[PDB]
Write a protein that binds this ligand. Structure first.
Ligand SMILES: [Ca+2]
Ligand SMILES: [Ca+2]
Ligand SMILES: [Ca+2]
Ligand SMILES: [Ca+2]
Ligand SMILES: [Ca+2]
Ligand SMILES: [Ca+2]
Ligand SMILES: [Ca+2]
Ligand SMILES: [Ca+2]
Ligand SMILES: [Ca+2]
Lengths: 497, 453, 453
């Protein structure tokens, strides 16, 4: 019970069934350590570094590594990985804001009905967080050509990873929405000495970092007609902190380029966006062919909670006081990822996504709803639903709203964003199999569609554009032919037009 | 009791309950040692650097570190940190055109920073004109705590290089000077600083070549709570370590805000009052300012604590704090710096916070000249009010850029009130402050505090 | 009793009670060794370096250091601080324009500095034109204490190199040349100096490459008191270690100011008289100039000491002391350098400071020519008077740019008096100094010294 094959100061028996660190030694995990705040760790007993990151299984579990690393990376299965980028601020004479998911959700196809079991979507242009596309806010309608009519860059580096990056020298190119111009590099005075997780260089409250190119008349027209400029990142070279026997943290020589193709090839990317700040986590997983491989196999639900440090109250996931269970989030998978998920779902009795295994190579994106209401404990709609009744016990989680007649919901434009397209999400139920549902949208895109609830809840998805700050109000019509059950209704924000 | 988990030459029993170093060996803390001048240290027995700073708990307690390190940085809870800023002394621009800037670096932390090469930003209005890094001409070989480079009595160094090997400042086009003539000024902010620190090696020398502070800025910032003390002319910035919220294996000691301020500045305490350099920093004698997150935590923590004082809240990880001593302070006991005496004041009382109170029968009026007031500045009037009757209404009339007329409801016990007003112009109308009382009211610790303009 | 806490080959019993080095090993101090020249050394037993400089207490005491270090730096309580500053000797202005300067580095410390790289500021009036760091052409390989680079007899090295490698120095516009024609001079000051020290490796050869002085500058300054001596034509800076006030764990020896001057200059003492190199530097025979902190510190400490002698006050960390030998000093015993003889002087006395005083009955008037005087300079009148009667008032009439007429009330015992006046213009009115006494007064140790312009 003391044998150590990999020699990482963790006995093999403890490492395969569960262990935790007390007083800098490994102890066998027990059910009684939960209420004390302890966590349960499981890793691979054949590898010193299960995740691939520079820090071994013992250094991460015991925390004997950098203190600027998130607690999320102390799990042996979660890789410490500084996913960084460049955020465009000034266009030179007009500022812009930057969307980290515009270039991902632009390639998502949305229909009305959905196939059984599966409740996500499909993306054809999956991209990471380093793939940054802007959205100009000071463009009030006048063209960029106005002002000269004759035929520099202020940026701010952003981190969304888990581990700090020292000596940050990002490399980007001016892709000018269709053709690259210059593969700019920041050499001597634009280098960030340190870049902590969920922080930018310069820190909040300082003027934008300036980096120091022709533009043709043709790009001027296209930029003035429904196009935006983005500054994609090809690579970023940094360093990281390593302890010593002398005790100093040495971050010269150590690179975040040696381990990147090691971390990347063994970890399954999981991404979550709260609408204001974006996170990217890598979770280790095992390849099917190799029998000697010993990386533990855990569900997505365990992978979600171990990556974003959520809380498992009951059976639903809470992240910073927000429900992030599989029912009130939007999952946007890539092509083969959905093939793996859909193929695995036929044999599962529970038929819930968060209970399926996790394999290396999948690209899961989680997009939290903008406004979501479940009639149970949480609501953030600025106006409540009309004709709300809770005298029920047939809800998806706790209780559903008896849609018998008509319910009106209204939300002003100021609570939304201009030049956007949304997704209407919810679940419907009607055991009678004799009542239909028709819905019409009061917006700049007006459409009416029919649908019928089934025995149990099923997801329905509807979309509409919101373009123009100074426009009319938004009203949604929910008409029921009889006794209709509704629960877990939400709306989201997709790409920008 | 001879164990040593973390290998830092301090037994875990002595490290957990209180210890001090006598003749380069650690001994158990005894309460009779405070009379010999010794201090009581408490630290965490699972970490070699409790604060994340380069020097371990043993080196910080025994004082075997750089001799320029302040004595309040010898606490294993306070982090040795250079907080280096660049202050602009003059600006020169002339003829296209050439701009020349004179700067003088300022250090405020508790550690010297050798070989400083700060990175500064040149910004006019939103746009960062240039991000300049220090060359060989402009590198400060030393910067002692609370000192400047060049030192006092010396001309500041000029900053006029794009790149290495003799480059020159130059605006790109005439647009900058065209808008410069409009009446716009240039600010100066630093994005980052690079320097060294010294460690006495095995050969007895001090090496500052394989060392840098950049390795520890991120670590210090993530395990410590920022605390600032402002004395009007001088500024101080410290960092005090604190335990993680939901961490079972974290052993960083829990201390209160008042104790941490005593530790981080080495301010003496004569029983209850806290004095730094003869200037009180007591809870009621100073105005505390917090950010968004810090205010929420204290308010939540207050309702569960019986004393209901700010200084008794257990310190946590991550808050931001600011302490600004009021510019003009009256307490009717030992300090009255107001240029003009107050009206209708009665010192015969015994119900004040410390020694006496001021019973007011009617109203109090004060005339403040603008001679000693900083023009184009924002000020906040502060004081304590007590009324056992709780049946008198108090209105305030303050003359400023906009006249302020507000009502105040006194409480049973002493309560702190804050009123903000803005005054613009040195040669403007005289500032008038008026307060009236329906009956008899008590006054103590009345102050006017400077704030950002 | 061979305990060694610091492990510097000096047992704690010796280092606390006094020790001296015999045959390169330490032996207990015995009072009979004074006649043979053996000196008494005392230092702190909790630190390898008591003074903080690169060399230990053993190496400083036993002399196993660089042979170019002065003798008085071999004291364990005196640090080996090199104070290097540049000397701006000449100007060359010609075409904007081009500037050329000749400078000569100076050393006035106790230890040499190898590979000197000064940093120089060219300040005209408020603005700083450019900051210059030493090039490979102007890096001085060697610099002995109380010496120069280049050595005496060689022309100064030119200063026309703007930046690294070499580019011609140039004023940026015509504006500074415009005000230069008005009569504005250009000043040069030293912001910093970077240099190496010299230690021996395990193989016996002096290696000076990786060792740098900029490390041991902050440490030595913040652990030692600042002492300066000016001998009229030269200056000598010395820094002496002093204990911390409130530390209970610091065991640094405490010495009087009088002994501090004796150690820091190796000044010989024949009982009470102190000689630097034949020039007396006794407290009564020289006047001292202090800063703010030392002025209030010294006054408070006097009233607790009966003798009331400056040289008998303990040295504490941080004080700044300046010693300026009197340029014109007469004592009527063995020295009188005044060009003109005094009036109404009687040497028949036995109540003087040392042997005799001046039995003045009436008034004394002196005529001082401008042949041996510096125009546009300030001088301070110093001397001692004794009047046991305490019934005669003395008024002084000193001619200067502003005529000075002040009254003096001498005390029963000997008292020092200070009077300030300014001399302007070489071809100006003759300076008249006259003092009158109501009765018979005693005078001794009359001094005149030069101050800043
Ligand atoms: Ca193992
Ligand atoms: Ca392992
Ligand atoms: Ca429910
Ligand atoms: Ca320990
Ligand atoms: Ca420790
Ligand atoms: Ca009181
Ligand atoms: Ca010793
Ligand atoms: Ca020693
Ligand atoms: Ca005499």
């Amino acid at each position: 019970e003391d044998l150590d094959t990999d020699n990482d100061n963790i006995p093999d028996a403890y490492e395969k069934n569960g262990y935790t660190i007390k007083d800098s030694i490994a102890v066998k995990w027990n059910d009684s350590f939960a209420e004390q705040g302890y966590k349960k760790y499981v890793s691979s007993y054949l590898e010193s570094n299960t995740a691939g990151d520079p820090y071994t299984d013992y250094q991460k579990a015991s925390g004997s590594i950098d203190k600027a690393i998130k607690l999320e990376a102390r799990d042996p299965l979660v890789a410490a990985y500084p996913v960084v980028g460049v955020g465009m601020e000034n266009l030179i004479s007009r500022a812009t804001t930057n969307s980290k998911t515009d270039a991902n959700t632009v390639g998502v196809s949305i229909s009305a009905g959905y196939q059984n079991g599966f409740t996500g979507n499909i993306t054809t242009s999956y991209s990471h967080t380093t793939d940054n596309s802007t959205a100009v806010q000071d463009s009030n309608g006048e063209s960029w050509n106005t002002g000269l009519s004759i035929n520099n860059a202020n940026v701010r580096y952003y981190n969304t990873g888990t581990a700090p990056m020292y000596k940050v020298t990002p490399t980007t190119n001016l892709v000018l929405d269709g053709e690259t111009l210059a593969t700019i590099k920041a050499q001597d005075n634009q280098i960030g000495n340190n870049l902590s997780p969920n922080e930018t260089y310069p820190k909040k409250g300082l003027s934008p970092l300036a980096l120091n190119i022709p533009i043709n008349y043709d790009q001027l027209k296209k930029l003035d007609s429904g196009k935006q400029i983005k500054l994609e990142t090809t690579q970023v070279s940094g360093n990281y902190g390593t302890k010593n026997s002398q005790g100093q943290i040495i971050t010269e020589g150590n690179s975040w380029s040696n381990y990147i193709s090691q971390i990347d090839s063994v970890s399954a990317s999981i991404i979550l966006d709260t609408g204001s700040q974006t996170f990217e986590r890598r979770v280790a997983a095992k390849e099917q062919g190799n029998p000697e491989d010993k990386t533990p196999e855990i569900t997505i639900g365990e992978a979600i909670k171990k990556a974003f440090s959520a809380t498992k109250n009951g059976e639903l996931l809470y992240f910073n006081g927000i429900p992030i269970d599989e029912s009130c989030v939007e999952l946007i998978f890539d092509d083969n990822t959905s093939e793996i998920i859909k193929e695995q779902l036929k044999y599962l009795d529970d038929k819930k996504i968060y209970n399926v295994k996790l394999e290396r190579g999948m690209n899961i994106l989680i997009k939290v709803p903008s406004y979501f209401t479940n009639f149970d404990e949480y609501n953030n709609f600025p106006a409540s639903w009309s004709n709300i009744d809770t005298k029920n016990q047939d809800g998806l989680q706790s209780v559903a709203n008896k849609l018998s007649g008509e319910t009106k919901i209204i939300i002003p434009m100021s609570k939304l964003k201009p030049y956007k397209r949304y997704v209407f999400s919810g679940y419907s139920k009607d055991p009678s199999t004799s009542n239909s549902i028709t819905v019409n949208i009061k917006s700049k895109e007006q459409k009416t569609d029919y649908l019928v609830p089934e025995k149990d809840y099923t997801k329905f998805s509807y979309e509409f554009e919101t373009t123009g700050k100074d426009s009319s109000d938004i009203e949604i019509t929910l008409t029921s032919s009889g006794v209709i059950f509704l629960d877990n209704l939400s709306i989201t924000e997709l790409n920008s037009t």
